Every structure is written in C-alpha cells, then in structure tokens.
Enzyme design. Sequence first.
Site, PDB file in Angstrom:
ATOM      1  N   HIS A 294       3.143   2.202   2.137  1.00  0.00           N
ATOM      2  CA  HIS A 294       3.363   2.588   3.528  1.00  0.00           C
ATOM      3  C   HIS A 294       4.627   1.893   4.020  1.00  0.00           C
ATOM      4  O   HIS A 294       4.830   0.729   3.687  1.00  0.00           O
ATOM      5  CB  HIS A 294       2.184   2.136   4.403  1.00  0.00           C
ATOM      6  CG  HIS A 294       0.946   2.945   4.211  1.00  0.00           C
ATOM      7  ND1 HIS A 294       0.692   4.058   4.987  1.00  0.00           N
ATOM      8  CD2 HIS A 294      -0.095   2.749   3.370  1.00  0.00           C
ATOM      9  CE1 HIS A 294      -0.474   4.533   4.565  1.00  0.00           C
ATOM     10  NE2 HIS A 294      -0.988   3.777   3.595  1.00  0.00           N
TER      11      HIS A 294
ATOM     12  N   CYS B 230       6.096   7.190   9.615  1.00  0.00           N
ATOM     13  CA  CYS B 230       7.103   7.861   8.810  1.00  0.00           C
ATOM     14  C   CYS B 230       6.588   7.769   7.364  1.00  0.00           C
ATOM     15  O   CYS B 230       6.292   6.663   6.881  1.00  0.00           O
ATOM     16  CB  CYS B 230       8.470   7.195   8.952  1.00  0.00           C
ATOM     17  SG  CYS B 230       9.718   7.827   7.791  1.00  0.00           S
TER      18      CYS B 230
ATOM     19  N   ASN C 178       0.798  -1.235   0.000  1.00  0.00           N
ATOM     20  CA  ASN C 178       0.000   0.000   0.000  1.00  0.00           C
ATOM     21  C   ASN C 178       0.831   1.287   0.000  1.00  0.00           C
ATOM     22  O   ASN C 178       0.266   2.357   0.258  1.00  0.00           O
ATOM     23  CB  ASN C 178      -0.942   0.040   1.202  1.00  0.00           C
ATOM     24  CG  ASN C 178      -1.832  -1.165   1.334  1.00  0.00           C
ATOM     25  OD1 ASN C 178      -1.974  -1.754   2.422  1.00  0.00           O
ATOM     26  ND2 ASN C 178      -2.470  -1.547   0.237  1.00  0.00           N
TER      27      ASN C 178
END
Lengths: 262, 265
Positions: free
Chosen positions: B188, B223, B186
């Site tokens: 991430h 992050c 995704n």
Amino acid sequence: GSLTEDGLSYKEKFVVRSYEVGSNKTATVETIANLLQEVGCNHAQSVGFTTTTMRKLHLIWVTARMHIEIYKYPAWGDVVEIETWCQSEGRIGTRRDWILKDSVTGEVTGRATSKWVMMNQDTRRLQKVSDDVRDEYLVFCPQEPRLAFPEENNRSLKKIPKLEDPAQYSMIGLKPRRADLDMNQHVNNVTYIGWVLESIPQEIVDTHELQVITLDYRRECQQDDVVDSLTTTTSDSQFLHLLRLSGDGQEINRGTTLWRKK
Amino acid sequence: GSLTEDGLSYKEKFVVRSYEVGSNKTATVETIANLLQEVGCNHAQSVGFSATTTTMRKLHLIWVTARMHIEIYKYPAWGDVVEIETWCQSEGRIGTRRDWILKDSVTGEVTGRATSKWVMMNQDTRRLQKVSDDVRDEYLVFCPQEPRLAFPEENNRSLKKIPKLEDPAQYSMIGLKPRRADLDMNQHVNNVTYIGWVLESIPQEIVDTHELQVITLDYRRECQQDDVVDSLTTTTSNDSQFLHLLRLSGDGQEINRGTTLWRKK
Ligand SMILES: O=C(c1cccc(O)c1)N1CCOCC1
Ligand SMILES: O=C(c1cccc(O)c1)N1CCOCC1
C-alpha cells in the site's frame, strides 16, 4: 557510530525502521544502500571532512560503480552493524568497502564495494590526480590490501554489456521528486537502484530475493530528466538492466541483478 | 525508545541522517512525517499491538488516517538529535487521535507538533464505521483519560475545513506515480508519499526562499500501485498560503486535499 581502535575503519549500528521494510518485513536493498551512504558520510565526518586541495580545484568524488551482495536482509526491529573503509587504487581512483553484520550473532549478512573517480564539479571532466591529493587520503586508509570482495576475478569487477532493444521488460516515464534529491539538489545514487528494479516483474519480486546487484553510473539524471528502465532475463534468475533518457535514449546507467528463489 | 513512567505516552530519539536533509541541511517535512509514523509504530508495539485490537483483527477492521496536521518551528539539522513524544486518545464513536511533540534533545525546547485523525474501515469492503464499545474499552487503557492535546487552541488550524481547488489550477505537477520504495510492508502507498506529491506542485522559487511552517492534509481515497496522480496548487494569500488537490490523472477522482503555510527565510 565510531572509528575502530586503529582509526582506519568506521562502525555504526542501525535499528531497522517500519517504513524501511518490504512485503517480507525485511529491509529493502534501497534501505541498505541508504545506510551504506550514511555510515560512509559519518566515516568522512569523523576523520575531518573531499580534501581542501580538491575543494579549491573544484574537484569532487563521484561514484562510477556500486556492487552489493546480501545473504540475509535485516528484519524490522533488528539491529545491523556496518563497518566501512576506504582505500586508494592508484591514479584510477578510490574504493569504499562495507561489511554488514547481525548485531546479535556477529555473522556477516552482507557485503558491498564501490569505485569512486575524481571529477571537476563544473566541467564534469575526469582528472584522476591533478597534483598530489593521494597523500591527504593515505593517512585515513589501510596500507595493506583490505577487500570486501577478495576472490580472484569476482562479481564486483565484471564487465556489464549494453542491453539491446527490444527489452523483455520495461518501466517508462520515471521521474525524480524532491524526496529523491540530496542536500545539493542532485538525484540520490540510491534512486537509480530503485529505478533499475522498477522494470523487474512483480512475479520475480514476490517469489525471489535479491542476492547480488551491480550498477555502473555513466551519466547523471538531472531534476528535469525522464528515465526509462529496461530489463532482460539472461539466465536462480539473472537480469541485464539499462536506464536511459526517455527522449533520445542517452544511457545514464547499466547493471545486473541475481535473484535466489525463496 | 520507551514508554514514559505512567505508560500512557511513548518517547524516542532520532539522529538526523545525511540523506534525510534538504538544501538547508535540515530535515525535510517528509523525513519528519516518517519519524512520526515510526515512533507511532513503536508505541503500538510496546503496548502489545501487532495497532489493531483483538476484535478488529477478527472483524477485518483497520485504523486508517483521515487527516494529518503538522507544524514545524525549527527543522532539525543533519547530525542533530530530535526527541518525539506520542500519545493516542479516543474521540468517542468518531475514531481516535494520535498526537506528537518534537523537541530539541540538547535544549528541551519544542521544535514541532503534530496531530492526526484516524477512522475505522473494513479492510475488504473499504466501508467506514463508527467505533464499537467493545473495541473502545480495549484501547482506553493505553490512553490518557483527561484531555491531552498537542493543539489545544480555540480556533486551531488542525480542525479547519479545507475546500476543493477549482480549475484552472495556478500550478501543477502531472503524471506522478509510485515506485516500490513508496510502498509499505503490505504493498500500500505510504501516507508520507502523498505529502511529497502535494509539495511537488509548489514552485521551486517558494521552496528556495521560504520554509514550510504548517501542512494539513485530508486523505479521501487511496492511490493504488497502478494509479497516476496529478498535483494541483493555487496561492490563497511575509507569509505565503496555498490550496492543494491530488486527483487521479484520468478521471480526476479526488484522492487528497490540503493547505500549506510558508514563512519567508
Ligand atoms: O558522469 C558521471 C556521473 C557524474 C555525476 C553523477 C552521476 O550519476 C554520474 N560518471 C561518468 C563516469 O564516472 C562516474 C559517473
Ligand atoms: O478512503 C480512505 C482511505 C483509505 C486508505 C488510504 C487512504 O489514503 C485513504 N479513507 C476513508 C475516509 O477517511 C479517511 C480514510
């Protein structure tokens, strides 16, 4: 995993893992290259392994070039079967080839080749043969030519030029972490593939699939070195790559990629 | 891999890979954490998930890790087979907990254990919220109803409060940034990358003479792909203890805090 009937090649099956896939839920080229390295290590292990002759001489096999062509990236949960074999190329060195296949249909989804040269682990100088290490190897290699890229003057044997500044794209200040090191505290060869692709614009990654990648290894990036990734479009989309030291611009790798529109 | 007889936990075997080991030719803590994540994903898949419930997909709600805790007694060697058993359990409205047990496939002995606290977050607003009853009942059927803890102890390490490292840090690794390999499907950053970043500030002298026994990590903020991280460490102590802090390289905004326990080889 296991050696085939003739004992001259090795096959292994791998289930594609959840953390091994990208945005398309298919294996990254870096996951693929890790599996090529793994099935290569298991092949060496199954046949008795560098020979004891080069072990004393402090000689190691080092990659000079990696070439990978992917037709279909295995999906998350899929099983991929990889067959690998080695072959001598005279005094120049050795070649390891791979064939990736869909475990359910038997169709070829990818192929790869790599050129390996002999180096003194301490002096970093190339030696080619030294004495008679060929005989030790020939028994574990097919004696008739067996090429993953048989085509006359194919992509795997193409000369790659040096990218000239200014680069069209760049990713600067790249540095290895402990996860990027192997069991000998040397940067993994697959990390360099990741660093080359960091300078590819996200627009390309999102709308294209990486079909071909060829990478020349010129100099080792140390644990305390910092790398700059450069890319320039040469065109399907084609790219020219250069990895160099962030300070003096000393070349560590050069390469090319070929991308197909989704 | 497969669900056990009662269908309330999942087990899977893994052959330790050549590129998965460190200098001691044994699995890194990062390889271990990847396998915990993998056997977790296969557990969700085997029981019908694609691990969000019908109600969570409708409400744009997702499960997010709040804490990871891992204790390793023996790191599996290259070529060894490790068996991991995982289970989930609800903790009322607070959230859910996923636990793991790592075992030697040849001897059956426990070589490690891990626990994690998961909270519910709206995918779009990033706002946390307690677990509703309708969601709770949907996954209670896939969980043991009697308490089953990987860390049952009274004053156990897995639930200890971690304080904020004060500047100046004793050690530091600055300018750390994620590459594409650090992203999940995704786009991430993978939770295991943060474990790697925490350990980057551990002096090489410690890594070379000690083995990582315990690691607890609090996840506070994600992050992003374009963020830059600074890893800070300070010794708090035969055993060496450390206090960790991961913060944004610019404004010093905390992303993670944690502790490690190392034993001399
Ligand atoms: O000097 C190296 C080398 C040595 C070790 C690691 C590395 O990535 C590169 N080479 C020069 C030509 O031969 C092949 C590569
Ligand atoms: O802010 C986060 C978060 C969300 C996504 C990824 C991440 O690394 C952290 N959390 C809210 C507090 O509880 C833990 C989760």
